[PDB]
């Protein structure tokens, strides 16, 4: 931080030194890059005008790196630098999306993610016009590209939802498709009675669910309800984290459009009842017992919130002692 702050003082004497030092040593650039992050956020733009092409070239050259942290650092640096002279950089960024590689596309989409800010900015119309093709025609080909696009969409919705206000319907089909589970991306290794399943696509599903939840702020008046709750109904039977997220979604939906929820309560709760009627696997560690216990408590809380008669009276000898712990 001290080096980055000092570099602002005499840009002509400090900026080139760090620029060449970054390429000189490979085991230290990871720190030096961070210092550069301060310059663009601390140096005068008018004084920074001359030293832009060199920084852009260095960032593009270092964009494709094996280290993930270095990739993140260069992406953040590019995003911060994109703030200045947008009229000169935005067309170039648009061009890179026509023939760029997967890593380059991921880096460029991550760079523009940080450009969004809660307060008004002069890049409002420019970003609004540019984000169209970024969000629409960049979720088909790749998996990492899909994940980064979903993350950027969620970040935009959380901070500034006006940009995705006129194109929400244009992207709804892709978001809905991304929620479906794929059994080609689920690997399993078995070496005895125990079993463990590893999923390479669970990250995208979590991002899609988070985006759907955050979309409830000021967009329910536009998106339809019937086409929206079908995917949630399908996703009730999903991973534990997604299960809790969906339960919390249902709890929040109790006070919003209760008529739609009541019109399908039966099928909403049927998977929930099936899950609650589950039993812990015999000869299992206490971790699984606790995990299933929290899942059951969350399910009970969800049904209690929704209630505020499809065989709702199912209080057996043991379960009867659970509700007093929830309320």
């Amino acid at each position: 931080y001290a080096l980055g702050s000092i570099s602002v003082g005499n840009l002509p004497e400090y900026l080139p030194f760090v620029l060449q030092e970054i390429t000189s040593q490979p085991k230290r650039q990871y720190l030096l890059l961070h210092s550069l992050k301060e310059i663009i956020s601390s140096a005068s733009v008018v004084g920074l005008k001359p030293y832009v092409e060199n920084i852009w070239a260095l960032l593009l050259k270092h964009c494709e790196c094996a280290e993930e942290g270095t990739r993140n650092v260069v992406a953040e640096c590019l995003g911060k630098l994109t703030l200045i002279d947008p009229e000169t950089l935005l067309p170039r960024l648009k061009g890179y999306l026509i023939s760029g590689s997967s890593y380059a596309r991921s880096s460029v989409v991550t760079a523009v993610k940080f450009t969004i800010s809660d307060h008004p900015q002069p890049i409002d119309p420019l970003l609004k016009n540019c984000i169209g093709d970024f969000l629409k025609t960049l979720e088909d080909p790749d998996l990492n590209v899909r994940r980064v696009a979903l993350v950027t969409f969620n970040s935009a919705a959380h901070n500034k939802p006006s940009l995705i206000r006129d194109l929400l319907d244009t992207v709804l089909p892709h978001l809905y498709n991304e929620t479906k589970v794929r059994k080609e991306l689920i690997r399993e290794v078995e070496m005895g009675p125990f079993k463990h399943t590893v999923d390479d696509g669970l990250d995208i599903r979590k991002a899609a669910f988070e985006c759907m939840y955050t979309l409830l702020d000021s967009c329910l008046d536009r998106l339809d309800i019937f086409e929206f709750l079908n995917h949630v109904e399908d996703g009730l039977k999903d991973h534990y984290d997604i299960k809790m997220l969906t339960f919390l979604m249902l709890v929040r939906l109790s006070t919003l459009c209760p008529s739609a929820v009541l019109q399908r309560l039966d099928r909403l709760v049927e998977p929930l009842r099936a899950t609650c009627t589950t039993k812990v696997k015999a000869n299992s560690v206490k971790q699984e017992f606790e995990k299933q216990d929290e899942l059951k408590r969350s399910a009970m809380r969800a049904v209690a919130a929704l209630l505020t008669s499809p065989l709702m009276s199912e209080f057996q000898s043991q379960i009867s002692s659970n509700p007093e712990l929830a309320a």
């Binding site: 993140n72 290794v189 070496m191």
Partner: protein, 79 residues
């Protein structure tokens, strides 16, 4: 101690992410049953585990935040 070499590499096989058939699991169980039917084995296993953790730490000492959380997560899951 006589068959200390036997099953030795096996201790690593569970740690390495490689598919192993149930026949090998049965064979290892049979060897363990035969050996059991002797506290030095416990100490040897503890020392081997400590050495493995030390070796893992040796590599996991040059990573900063936002780049070591995932590595720690996968290592904990594997362990």
């Amino acid at each position: 101690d006589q068959i200390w070499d036997d099953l030795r590499a096996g201790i690593q096989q569970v740690y390495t992410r490689q598919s192993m058939a149930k026949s090998r699991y049965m064979e290892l169980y049979t060897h363990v049953y035969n050996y059991c039917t002797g506290l030095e084995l416990y100490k040897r296993l503890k020392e081997f585990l400590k050495n493995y953790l030390t070796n893992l730490l040796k590599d996991g000492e040059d990573l900063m935040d936002e780049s070591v959380l995932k590595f720690y997560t996968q290592q904990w899951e594997d362990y």
